[PDB]
Design a binder for this molecule. Sequence first.
Ligand SMILES: CCCCCCCCCCCCCCCC(=O)O
Ligand SMILES: CCCCCCCCCCCCCCCC(=O)O
Lengths: 237, 60, 60, 57, 57, 57, 255, 125, 267, 267, 67, 104, 104
Amino acid sequence: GLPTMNTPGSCQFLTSDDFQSPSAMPQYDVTPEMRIPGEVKNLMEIAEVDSVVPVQNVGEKVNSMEAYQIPVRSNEGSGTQVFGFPLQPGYSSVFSRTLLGEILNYYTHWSGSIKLTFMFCGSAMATGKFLLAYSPPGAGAPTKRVDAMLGTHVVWDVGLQSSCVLCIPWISQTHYRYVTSDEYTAGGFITCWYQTNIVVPADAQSSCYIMCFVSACNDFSVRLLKDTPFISQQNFF
Amino acid sequence: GLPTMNTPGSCQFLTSDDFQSPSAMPQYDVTPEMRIPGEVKNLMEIAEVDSVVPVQNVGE
Amino acid sequence: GLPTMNTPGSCQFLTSDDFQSPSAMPQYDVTPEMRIPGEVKNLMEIAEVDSVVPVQNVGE
Amino acid sequence: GAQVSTQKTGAHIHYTNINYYKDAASNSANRQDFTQDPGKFTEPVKDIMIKSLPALN
Amino acid sequence: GAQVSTQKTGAHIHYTNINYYKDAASNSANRQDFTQDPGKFTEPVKDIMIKSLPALN
Amino acid sequence: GAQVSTQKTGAHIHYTNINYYKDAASNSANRQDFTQDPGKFTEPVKDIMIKSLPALN
Amino acid sequence: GYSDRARSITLGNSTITTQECANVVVGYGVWPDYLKDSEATAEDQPTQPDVATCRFYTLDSVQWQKTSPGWWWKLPDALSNLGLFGQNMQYHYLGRTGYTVHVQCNASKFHQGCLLVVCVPEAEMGCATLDNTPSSAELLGGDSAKEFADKPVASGSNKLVQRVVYNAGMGVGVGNLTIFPHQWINLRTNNSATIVMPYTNSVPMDNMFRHNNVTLMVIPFVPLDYCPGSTTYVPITVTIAPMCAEYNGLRLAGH
Amino acid sequence: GYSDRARSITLGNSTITTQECANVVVGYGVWPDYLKDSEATAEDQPTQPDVATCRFYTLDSVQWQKTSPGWWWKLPDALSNLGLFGQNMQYHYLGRTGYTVHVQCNASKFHQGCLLVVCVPEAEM
Amino acid sequence: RVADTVGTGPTNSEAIPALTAAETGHTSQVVPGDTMQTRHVKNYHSRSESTIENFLCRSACVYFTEYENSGAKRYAEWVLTPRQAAQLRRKLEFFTYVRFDLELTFVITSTQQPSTTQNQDAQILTHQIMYVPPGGPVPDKVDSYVWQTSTNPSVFWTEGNAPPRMSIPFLSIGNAYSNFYDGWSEFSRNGVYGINTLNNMGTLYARHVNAGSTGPIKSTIRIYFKPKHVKAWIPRPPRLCQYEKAKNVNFQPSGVTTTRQSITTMT
Amino acid sequence: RVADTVGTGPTNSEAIPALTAAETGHTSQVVPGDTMQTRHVKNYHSRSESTIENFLCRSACVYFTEYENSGAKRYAEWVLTPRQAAQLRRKLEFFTYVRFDLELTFVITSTQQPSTTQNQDAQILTHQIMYVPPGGPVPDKVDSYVWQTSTNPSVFWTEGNAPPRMSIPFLSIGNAYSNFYDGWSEFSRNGVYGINTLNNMGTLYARHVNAGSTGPIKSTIRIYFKPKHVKAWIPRPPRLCQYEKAKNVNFQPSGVTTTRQSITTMT
Amino acid sequence: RVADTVGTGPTNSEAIPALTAAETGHTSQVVPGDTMQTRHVKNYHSRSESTIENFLCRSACVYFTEY
Amino acid sequence: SITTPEEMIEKAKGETAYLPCKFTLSPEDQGPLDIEWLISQVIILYSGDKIYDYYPDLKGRVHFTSLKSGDASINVTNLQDIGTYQCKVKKAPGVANKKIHLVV
Amino acid sequence: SITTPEEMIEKAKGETAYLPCKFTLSPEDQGPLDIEWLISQVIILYSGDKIYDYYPDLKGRVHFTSLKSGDASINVTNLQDIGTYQCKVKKAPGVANKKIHLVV
Ligand SMILES: CCCCCCCCCCCCCCCC(=O)O
Ligand SMILES: CCCCCCCCCCCCCCCC(=O)O
């Protein structure tokens, strides 16, 4: 009879504990593993892949394939805004449904860089230049191409290589940010303007589209496992 | 008094567990084994033997 | 089944005890410490500092 | 005086065990005893019968 | 026969573990397995694409 | 892999400890950490002031 | 000194050559091979034609209009009635194979469009009714196009399949379908898309007639557009080539 | 193996990328550098932001019509009200700097035009 | 551990890391140092909590049922299936094939039901949980000879102690559990379509060993799954449409995402 | 261990240890041997109980709430905050920034409420405590699908055993918890001013898994915090004015100390 | 552990593994490779759960009575 | 699992109405078989391997087409009979049901 | 957290009274939003994304200025109305309230 003493925390059930337990089927021979292609070892390999972003999620576009498309055209001006949205990868309506955004909805903290790739989907005769800009929080959304230039920007020239990559870096005071909408840990703003104007010849379409893909860099991380707010079960199916 | 802590799965009975238990008859002398012919060590030695198959199991 | 025996003082809560407990958030990566100035390691470093004394604490 | 043995794992780990009683009928069961010999039930003949050769020549 | 491993600590300790069952499906989970290989999902092409060079030349 | 340390006794004994979790935030508290440095709060000046010499000469 | 835009593929007595292409996607980094001796379970010896099956079969073309939602094909079901590949799978009980999908769509500089080519393993699809399940010959099509449909399919007592393009018939976001090996055809640059897929299953061999390993999907994210005068009929063509195919369990023909 | 028609320039937190270009002209063979200790005259120490000024500022666009004569800009006067470059020159008495001029004009194969881009030192008018 | 950011400077060259082709799958492997000037920053962040083991290995309720100690409903039964709930199912349906050991936990609680009997002084209740493999005999009633549990694994629990927990080895005739199956069980291709064809996990039975009183009492059992030693293959996109049934992937078409006001709106 | 007193003798010299300038912060480092004759005295007193770890590492109740097993209030909720009480808060507000692991303990006790029902023979009550992270779904009612706890950490307890204890790792996006914050969450500087801006510790939910009887029962839960592995920076003076609210440092001006009778009075 | 299947080929010979006499108890020790062509297949299946110990060593109710 | 649980059958009057309820027994399901046909209250009942002929209007009109094999369909006649028929097949481990709507 | 919970507003008669109740939702607070205005007994109620127009004297006088964004203010009119208005905003995890005193 070895003398022992029970500490607080006995005979309790923890949703997240790591103990051994007696097997109910002793001396069971499992099937020998075969090599199935494409093994996942971490969730940050599912997040580093591109996913089309629904930027035009306005009105009834969400019930159509039109949501993904960004409409660009030829106008008698310059410096007009194409699109803009905030940098909230888990919470913004724009990113909530993408692979990386859905992965973030299972975590509380996120920290890293963000890749944004744009592919031009117009004619092979149409040409133009765009200004892709990222503005850090402190002063509101830039309302002009001139205010946007003062922030991190990339001038994209459409040619043989249709795609372009704007890499939003980690500028934060803290080490991590909040996936949920918060005001202390604010993200920034991402806007797109016309660096020049869309140039189209005759007998070609002057109304084109762009597509946007979002992924993570090699320095992305997440923490605090939580429950996604998206799924809802009325009753046992 | 060594401090311990009880995990879930205590004081339960499992139809298939492997534990030690105090013998109710201490220092008991069992009979010395004799060699009886035909020892079974696995059930797959009873299965490798031929058995007549009732193929015509029709009606009566 | 190792035979043990519970001593008095089991299943009690002590406002001042020193035991281990299973973490509720397994494999959590804490933020790397930065050097903030002026670290306190003992309360007898807060006491060795001068403090104005209210000697004339009379009336109002 | 503890005995360290192998755990039952799949194909394609060690565990520790100590005996706490002095009775030898208190220990756990012997689950890892993989020995077969079906030459008693199957092939129970006197003259060995090779597979390729005929049975009765 | 006990195994001593490292605890999960912050940056900028050892712990002991023994297996009490003989089943290999009774042990605790494998939480410290930090191995990645995203070259399957990302960059799944035949001809390697260098970063600095153009994609289609 | 157990750690043996000293017990808190009066002046004018060893104890054993093993870590049973793999989290490093499950261990007991660190009560025996006797290190002081009051040169930050007290004497926080630039030019060192000797005791015997005058303060302002 | 050559151009990476030019590629040639030779299988059996067939060849394909491209003037403009992007690259070749090789599945999950795995090139399809044969079954090893430590992974197999069936005892009897496999047959391996090696040339009469592993060649290029060209399925029926489909017109890409200005309002086409998209198309889908079951790779095992599609080559069921084509060449000796169909005959071998008919007689045998167990079949193991890999494929490649070369999709060709050629347009002029003035034409503008975008197509997504993705292979989905275990692409189980849902029914319009919530209580019943999709009927065969409604989900499956022999050498047939099997197009999708913008807007939901009506709910009633009918084994019709839900063909919504935005949910893709699986209930998942159409945009996130880039997790599987995918290639994009951009009329202004890419003309064709090549994808190589290794055999993927939870078992070594499977019955080709009752199970489909992968589903090829072609979805126009950006519509087709042009000006009055340019050619309106713009077709898409698909060629599939089984790779390292082997069969087991020979028996009477049928299914 | 790449094409000399493609170029990228990175300065500060800004980048420009070209699909079609000619080359880069480098002034009089001189790459801009800082002031040496044997060429200076002022005694007090200079300030060098190094990142908040040396980036790309994008001026207002101009429509090229079929009857446009031409345009001119003063480089010191143009960046006077833009970003921190304008603020630093405002407070200080003496400023020394170099520049680069990326002019972008994109048209289709059918469009035909010619533009001359030249920098004139001491262009008294 | 994550990669550390390096330091670059001003650059004027023919190199084009940003410009690329998304026609190819090739996800651009660019880093911020390619499109701006960066400082050197050591990164001590570790990719530890994101591993599939830490993601899936947490207990999760999959089914809770009731039984009584008198009347008609005297025992409970439930075919083993993780698709009864939504939270555990959605997480498992990130992958096509999974292979994991299972840790099972039960939570059994009783409640005295309204009645009019008098002098009710109950005793401690003992409950028996029994598993029947695909093919084993199933109990017709609450006093059937099936409960002898000669070979079926069973567990007995006396109300008041720590819950009962047991560990189950990977049980499958295949080489991996299949979350999604595209096909039929019958060759003629006319029958059950879907994963239902593959599933064969047996049935679970729970009941009161003793009555314990003269008044009615209703017990409830909740089952908790924990995947251990997890392996996973071929990832797939998360479920957008809400679940409808447990046997199939039947859904109702829904919006790709939520809507805002304009395309330039920040909220 | 403390320093030992040494021995000095009579002295006539120009050295002036006593005379100094308090204009400089320089706290005089004089010892009694400088202004009198002392004897040598070894000092075995040890500065051990005064360390920050021994000061802060003791359990302390921070919040106690109730719930029922019938009616309207069927579950309890509480955002995690140590400023609810005064004793734990005052001790933590000796420092500006603290960084410590937390040990959590709960004490749950039930009480049979007055009613008029008859034949009440209750069963053992089981209680479930669930944590929701900043952003997790919150239970609308007591039978909501949220309690499935697929990923949220939860704990189940059967009335009668040792209390439930769990250990929590330093949870923060910063590098130290901040007891005092001088600033706003919004840049426009018009909103919430104070520490409230920084705090984000999630919410805690407690409830009865089963009813257990026909009569009413009210349970109460008390939460106990214990800081472990403590680090602390920048000390500050103790709170004189009594606390008013939990979100801010709002106070009522009070006397610097208590009053006596005269300036020469000894009491 | 179970035996692994080997690989045979086409055969034309006087050997008769199939033909035998069941008058004798001698249970024919033939394997599939004797009446067809087989491929080599390593077999990692183990005869472990069939042993008499694993068969009999499980608790089983034998009698329940009242008082 | 009964195939096509939600189904609607339109049959002309004077023509025998054919209602099909084919099912596939689960390997897990190993219990006594019960097949019950409801008219929305029963027309026919199969239980303990016995068929019982419940509804006065459909008496002598409702009979099975085949049950043990896996087919539990009925062939009604003399339609006048508009209603919903629910075929409920019971196995001790698991249960399934199919509802058919008949017009005229 | 509603800013300025204790506030007093003096407005002249014949001038619409403006009452402001701006709030900042906590990251911890993620529940259905309810905004209720009390007059010390309700003038207006916002619940389940629906606005309901309660008080006979202030019927057709009380309307919101903006709610989802974070502004839940009202603009009253035809003052005669001296009383205390308590703006209570409810989130499932946390709740806050602001009381405004209006003279004449
Ligand atoms: C009293 C003993 C009880 C033992 C019960 C054992 C039941 C095991 C059930 C395992 C179900 C696993 C299903 C996984 C399906 C999937 O991953 O797709
Ligand atoms: C059933 C699981 C419960 C788990 C609950 C975990 C809650 C952790 C809360 C930590 C609060 C720490 C606040 C410190 C604030 C300060 O020091 O200023």
